[PDB]
Amino acid sequence: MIILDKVSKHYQTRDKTRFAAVEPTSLEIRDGEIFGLMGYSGAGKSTLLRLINLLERPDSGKVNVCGQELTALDAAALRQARQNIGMVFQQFNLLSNRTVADNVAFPLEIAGWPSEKIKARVKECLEIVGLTERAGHYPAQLSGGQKQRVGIARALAPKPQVILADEPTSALDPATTRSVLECLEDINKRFNVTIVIVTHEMSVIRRLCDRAALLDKGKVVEIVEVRGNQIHAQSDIGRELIRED
Amino acid sequence: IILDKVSKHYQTRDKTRFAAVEPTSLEIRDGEIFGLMGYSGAGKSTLLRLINLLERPDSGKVNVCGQELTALDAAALRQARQNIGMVFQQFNLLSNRTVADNVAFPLEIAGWPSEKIKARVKECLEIVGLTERAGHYPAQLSGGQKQRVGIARALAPKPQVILADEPTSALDPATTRSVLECLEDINKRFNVTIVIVTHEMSVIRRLCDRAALLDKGKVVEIVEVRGNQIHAQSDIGRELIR
Amino acid sequence: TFQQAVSTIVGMKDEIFRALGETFVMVGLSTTFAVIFGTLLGVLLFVTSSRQLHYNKLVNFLLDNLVNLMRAFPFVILMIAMIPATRAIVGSTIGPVAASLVLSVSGLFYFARLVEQNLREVPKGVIEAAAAMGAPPIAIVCKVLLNEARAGMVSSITVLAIGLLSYSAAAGMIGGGGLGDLAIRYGYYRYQTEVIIFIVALLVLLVILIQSTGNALARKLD
Amino acid sequence: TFQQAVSTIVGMKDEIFRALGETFVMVGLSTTFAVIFGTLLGVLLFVTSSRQLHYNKLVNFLLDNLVNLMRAFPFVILMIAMIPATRAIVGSTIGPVAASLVLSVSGLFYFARLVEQNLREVPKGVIEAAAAMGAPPIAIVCKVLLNEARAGMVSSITVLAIGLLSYSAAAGMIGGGGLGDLAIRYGYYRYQTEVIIFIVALLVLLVILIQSTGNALARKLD
């Protein structure tokens, strides 16, 4: 149940990074539902997802995650909290010089599990995505949809309470995009909550979001509830964002 | 603009992003906007190159605007390539010259007088509404402005055909709507017979007159999107439409 | 300190002004010929690998391997084996000009690799876009490649000049001229401080000056 | 004459073997220290460049300047100026081991430059995920960083080995370094043609063998 409170970021005039600035915003995501951060080319969505994880650090406010105020941890304690918040990336961010079973086993190895349990988990969370038939190959021998499945299966191996997804299926063609989203529905069966999925489009938002948020240049304008695969936006500048349907 | 027949099979060790195409024949009419559609690997991008005959086919004949391009010598082909405007997914525009110079580059190859080159470029910037940024350099423009410069360099030699290699794939919906209206205005005022590759049916519902659905390097069907609703008799066709 | 200053100024003002006069001619006359012939060779290394401007696998293979060999060979060994050939063209085995012939042959192959590397980083699309409008091959290479790699050549000639300065010091001992022919006199025999500190100080300042000039000009054009 | 030439070479049988066995002691011994210390130096350069272990800016500025300066500086001048310091450490100035110490010094800076450029080529996104999974900065430079760039370190070692071979010839004039000393006699003071072609052929063979082994090992690892 992530609750943010007057969080903000601004960058130097150098503006070396692609990420845009975010302005004071408070959002509460419930423990029983999936969320989504709609916007556009600059917007402020990508930095807002990193601010949940403190991979970007705010100038103000408190980031509260799972009942721990993460800006107060400021230590080797923070790198134990980041174990319970997983993440899947747009481009796949997979180690290329080790086999898929090891890519999946890498989070379990990092915590300090004995190898015997690591093997059982690598088997389980790898059959769940339906990829146990390719447990020996290398990322150079897989397709885009398969690489995204490896990312979901790595994200799931720490048994994380929250999974954060950054534009995961935008590159994928429609046939793969349906397969990767169906796998996310399978994840919602077990105790995995708040799968915040960032997207610069609406097809993904209507299909699997329970609630959604909209913005203009770092300022959230309106949060909607997606029922029967529609949106019914009340906001004015918001209506322009929804036309993407 | 007809392909009598064509094919190309890429030899291995070339590892090109392109995929092989098989015995296909097509007839884009005068004034028509015709869309090539298919998932990645359908071979739409390969089919587009074969028209300007950059990629040379293994066999068959390419008839563009009367001339048979396949039998032509290199010096004559350099005129056939000039006759066809092209735009690309990655902008592919020279970075060390100003917005005006990029439009002028095709006109200078054509050995045009320099006073004439000056007159046409101001007119071309006039059409794509970027006259104000004539002196700016291509590292200062947004993604949409870079595409609207690419369309102007394509229309500068007064072409009778344009080819479009999925130009809007990188653009958001708010800028995508403003560049598709430019291809509508160019077709309505000048009859340029534009051809277009894409992986999404949504752009076709916005722009095309007919379309070709490509699967594994062969056409399954030629649909009509003029009615504004794509309708497919086959099974593969009806899957791509969804 | 006056012992260092007095020693340096009186005796060494007669010798230092000769040694700097010999080092600038040894480097200046060699760099010009290396930039003028390395450009041509580096272009041929490229066009015969493009598939567009021209293609010929055999020539590409031969030229590439020859360039690799001549770049990996010890320069000092080549100069001492080339003394009769150098003595036929120059007419004399000793002098800055004689060391200048061997330096130009080593820079020629040295700069032919940098230009090709700079041309390989130009985006492939800008070549396909220029072939789309029927640009003749001699007009692609001249108006596209040598205008896009414009900012990459200047840094390349900055690295060649720093390279042919280090080679010049080695030449001064086998043959003649330079701060290398000065350093053996006050270092290998009669090891003498004061003068060795001055030789070390002058080189650092001159290396910094050439590097600063190269970066500023490259940044302007980019 | 052919038999006169070949008969001459077998007359030098003992000296040639000494030249080779003395060249290997200079290259084979300095490369180990170069790779042991340049690796640490390059890792230190890389970590202070990112948000891993630290983002010091002053330390990175100093270190980056230090390595550029100590690669720009000429090699022959450095050895002549290091005569007393080298003599004190080895107890001698003349000999292959004393010269190898100087070769190792230059090697650490060159290897660090190569390793830093290798590490700076891994995509940041893979390292970004390694931070999201709670791995401490030391774990980052051991499992995430090393696995991705190990295929490129072997190429760096291959280029370094050839780089130090060229320097050995320059130290040959002063340190009597095997083939470099052999080149100075029978090539300058005199000109024994049949023993010059032999040296050139032998060096070409060595260069080819090193390049070929390095390429194969680099290919098998990635």
Numbering used by the authors:
A (entry chain D): 1 to 245
B (entry chain C): 2 to 243
C (entry chain A), D (entry chain B): 5 to 226
Task: Give sentences copied directly from the paper behind this entry.
Here, we show that NmMetQ is a lipoprotein (lipo-NmMetQ) that binds multiple methionine analogs and stimulates the ATPase activity of NmMetNI. The overall architecture of NmMetNI is similar to previously determined structures of EcMetNI, comprising two copies of each TMD and NBD, encoded by MetI and MetN, respectively. Each MetI subunit contains five transmembrane helices per monomer for a total of ten transmembrane helices per transporter. Using single-particle electron cryo-microscopy, we determined the structures of NmMetNI in the presence and absence of lipo-NmMetQ.
With 1 mM AMPPNP (below the Km), the structural analysis of an equimolar mixture of lipo-NmMetQ and NmMetNI revealed that NmMetNI was captured in the inward-facing conformation at 3.3 Å resolution; no densities for either AMPPNP and lipo-NmMetQ were observed. For this data set, the two dimensional class averages showed clear structural features, suggesting a high level of conformational homogeneity. A comparison between NmMetNI and EcMetNI reveals similar subunit folds, with the root mean square deviation (RMSD) of 2.4 Å over 843 Cα atoms. As predicted from the primary sequence, the NmMetN subunits lack the C2 autoinhibitory domain. As a result, the interfaces of NmMetNI and EcMetNI are distinct. In the inward-facing conformation of NmMetNI, the NBDs interact directly. In contrast, in EcMetNI, the inward-facing conformation forms an interface through the C2 autoinhibitory domains, with a slight separation between the NBDs. For MaModBC, which does have an autoinhibitory domain, this distance increases to ˜27 Å. A comparison of these structures suggests that type I ABC importers share a common quaternary arrangement in the inward-facing conformation such that the presence of a regulatory domain increases the separation of the NBD:NBD distance in comparison to the homologous structure without a regulatory domain Figure 4—figure supplement 2D.
